[PDB]
Amino acid sequence: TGHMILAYMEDHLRNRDRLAKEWQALCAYQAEPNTCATAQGEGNIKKNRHPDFLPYDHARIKLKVESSPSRSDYINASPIIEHDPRMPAYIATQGPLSHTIADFWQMVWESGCTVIVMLTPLVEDGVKQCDRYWPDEGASLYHVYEVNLVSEHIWCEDFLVRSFYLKNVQTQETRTLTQFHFLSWPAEGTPASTRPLLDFRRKVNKCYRGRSCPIIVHCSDGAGRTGTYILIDMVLNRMAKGVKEIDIAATLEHVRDQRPGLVRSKDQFEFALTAVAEEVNAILKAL
Template sequence: MEIWRVESLLPLIATLFLGVVILGTGTLFCIKTLVPGNPSCFPDDRRQSMSRQPSFTYSEWTDAKQEDFYELDAVPETPVFDCFMDMKTEADPVTLSVKPVGLQERRGSNVSLTLDMCTPGTTEPYGALLSPREQSTHEYLQNASNLLTPEQLHKRALDDAALQAEFYETPMNFVDPKEYNFPGVVRKNRYKTILPNTHSRVCLKAKEEGDFLSTYINANYLKGYGGKEKAYIATQGPTVNTVGDFWRMVWQERCPIIVMITNIEEKNEKCTEYWPEDSVICEDIEITVKLVIQADDYSLRIFTVKSEGEERTLRQYWPRLFWIWLGKWRKRGNRLRPTVALSLSTAVQGLDALAVSLLPLSCASS
């Protein structure tokens, strides 16, 4: 009789337990539904990319306290550039941090760099008005100098940590694309977000009066030792569309030296091979290879250039137009090995003439 009673109670006990579980679950669901929870850091309609502003340095972001970081206004006072990270609504404020990036990502080579032309929620164009902070940044970028002896350069190059720190402390420089809002200009830039500064841009002679496009090349004059104006020209690796413009610039500026600090191809094309195997005529300029010298750390090509009955030889700034093409790269960090850079510097040191440098527009040697 007792066994029958226990077996009869088991279904009843199981039913009561299941009912308690269901009732408890329903109660918790009602509480969560009726009582509002903590709002997310940023609503969906106000979600935006949080990245460093043009007048800030990288260290100012990483050194800031997290609580100060979240006290920033939802709409920043200056335009932002979507370079580093996205802050999503599901992000955890406790674990969220700014992800440090390498040199390649910082300059935006193999990744697409998106520019927000206006402050979110406004129609103010970037570059219309510079804040005092941005004005001082522009002045710093134009006037800063850090002269090093070869010995100091060699020592500095061996200290990767110090080199990285100095790099990230340098303010970033961006140019308002509206400065070059002309038809056809976009196909003359390898990257749409890397443009020449207007105050020091190299202007080619116009083929026709009022033809702005024929005057444009993505190149800037650089100061030299002692603040010498127009000591160098920094330009992008020529594209198929700009080979003629490049040689026009070389001839117009009477450049005896070209320093190429880029690869022809690295995942994608970085520079069109615009020199001939023997001889070629480009934009009424005849370019002829006279000699190729293979050094330990770079290749040296000697050209002669002719145009309008004139041949550039020893009578110019340098005996002939020298093309210095770096052949050895160190993949670590996409940087030149210090010994290669020093060897190149020694090779061209003391040349009192305008040199063209095909600089990498990113750290992947564009």
């Protein structure tokens, strides 16, 4: 029953001492292993937006060195899996820097990715969160990846959708890609409703995802909002398959085994649980 599981989450949400104790336990959570030595190496420091938010050595996206303009494998990006391969995978990554824009697109190309989730505005009260990695109009060429803005649909003030035609100009292969851009999510504190994000999520998940390809999810540090989104999606997707592991804190633990520090605040943790419960509610009210 969803009525049973929804009753559980609502009790969980009202229980602020349980919340505080889960979060405390999560602040002390440490993966094994947890080394980020390659990311911290001297060549790579300039390629990270935030020094505290890095991929683990055991779980990082490796660019194909021969295809890289700088001949490096490094991008601040982490694969996030389940053990089952039939389940939805992600790449959690930082918002591209000006000098990592060609790295980002090489990652998009080699991963197979047809969906990008962007969770930040480019600038948040005067603080730059992300560099623009897409053309505002027409086409832009980043190394060998020609990105063509086909369509922009503003659905509301909370979110819009860009559709792109992507060409590898070397091989002449083509791909369609959709960027889902959420505009209204602050880096500190949460959105006052979970509604618009959940509507946004329904549009993301109905999009053509590719043949077993990751969704790329990013914000600024690729940890705070990125993690909170991936947590909500992961919990809800598991529920839909009727998976028996229904524990949000343990699910967050599974995400932090793969990229460190995801979900940055207790507010984001509590928002995630509120969003999961609002979606379950919504599904039932439609039945």
